[PDB]
Amino acid sequence: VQAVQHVVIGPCVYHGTLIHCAVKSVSQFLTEGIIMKDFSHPNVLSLLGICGSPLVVLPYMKHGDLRNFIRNETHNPTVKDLIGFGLQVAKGMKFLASKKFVHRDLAARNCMLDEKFTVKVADFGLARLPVKWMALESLQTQKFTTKSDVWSFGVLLWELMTRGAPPYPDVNTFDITVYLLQGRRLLQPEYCPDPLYEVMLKCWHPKAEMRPSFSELVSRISAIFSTFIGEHYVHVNATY
Numbered sequence: 238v239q240a241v242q243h244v245v246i247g248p249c250v251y252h253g254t255l256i257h258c259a260v261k262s263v264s265q266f267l268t269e270g271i272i273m274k275d276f277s278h279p280n281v282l283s284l285l286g287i288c289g290s291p292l293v294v295l296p297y298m299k300h301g302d303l304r305n306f307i308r309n310e311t312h313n314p315t316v317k318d319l320i321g322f323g324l325q326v327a328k329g330m331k332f333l334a335s336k337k338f339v340h341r342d343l344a345a346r347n348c349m350l351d352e353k354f355t356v357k358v359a360d361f362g363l364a365r366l367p368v369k370w371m372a373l374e375s376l377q378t379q380k381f382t383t384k385s386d387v388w389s390f391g392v393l394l395w396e397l398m399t400r401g402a403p404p405y406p407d408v409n410t411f412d413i414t415v416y417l418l419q420g421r422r423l424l425q426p427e428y429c430p431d432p433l434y435e436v437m438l439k440c441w442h443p444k445a446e447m448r449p450s451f452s453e454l455v456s457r458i459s460a461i462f463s464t465f466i467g468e469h470y471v472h473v474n475a476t477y
């Protein structure tokens with residue numbers, strides 16, 4: 238009854254103020270907002286408040302989604318930059334995992350970049366089959382876990398290192414499961430350091446309990462990230 242008051246605010250998505258905002262178009266809605274509001278992490282997209290239209294108000298993200306940022310030819314990411322985006326995502330997913338939150342649709346298109354170029358994992362909560370991002374077991378059961386978020390994460394790093402290339406462009410979505418089960422993974426991007434590809438393959442472990450945790454991923458990617466100085470510019474493949 239009064240439990241939603243901290244979430245509520247008075248005076249398709251629209252621009253807004255109060256902070257620059259995205260403002261999107263009953264009992265479930267009140268409860269969900271309260272769950273969503275109690276998530277707070279620098280790498281997870283905030284719920285600012287809810288309003289009656291009804292309205293969901295989120296922070297406006299200056300640079301938009303992460304797949305479009307990296308695809309833009311007038312941006313010049315270095316390997317360091319891109320591993321840095323991956324490290325941020327991993328930190329957001331670590332938080333969501335600690336909250337027992339299974340994202341289910343982790344992808345570069347669903348992460349956003351604010352004005353400080355902080356990546357926020359998004360498209361979850363009220364702010365919400367992606368077969369080419371899905372774990373083998375989830376393609377088989379339509380059941381998702383944190384370890385199946387880990388798989389998606391490994392696809393997301395792939396997207397990172399290719400500057401937003403579509404995964405398995407030659408495989409039709411209806412076919413991905415058969416393709417994978419022949420014994421295949423995504424190939425190593427031209428600008429993907431060997432140590433980061435090893436991580437990708439770990440994230441794609443055939444056994445779900447064997448994939449690293451997001452805590453493990455943060456630690457590991459934080460180390461590899463620190464080895465770079467932003468001297469290597471990542472260019473775009475001609476085949477993708």
Ligand SMILES: O=C(NCCN1CCOCC1)Nc1nc2ccc(Sc3nnc4ccc(-c5ccc(F)cc5)nn34)cc2s1
Pocket residue numbers: 250259261282295296297298299300301302305346347348349359360361364365
């Ligand atoms: O669009 C910009 N910035 C403009 C960036 N441009 C690019 C062109 O070059 C000029 C600079 N900021 C925004 N912030 C927000 C904040 C919240 C929301 S609702 C929401 N909730 N969860 C999600 C998750 C993903 C998406 C999404 C996906 C693809 C997209 F394409 C745009 C948005 N939305 N979403 C929309 C926006 S859009």
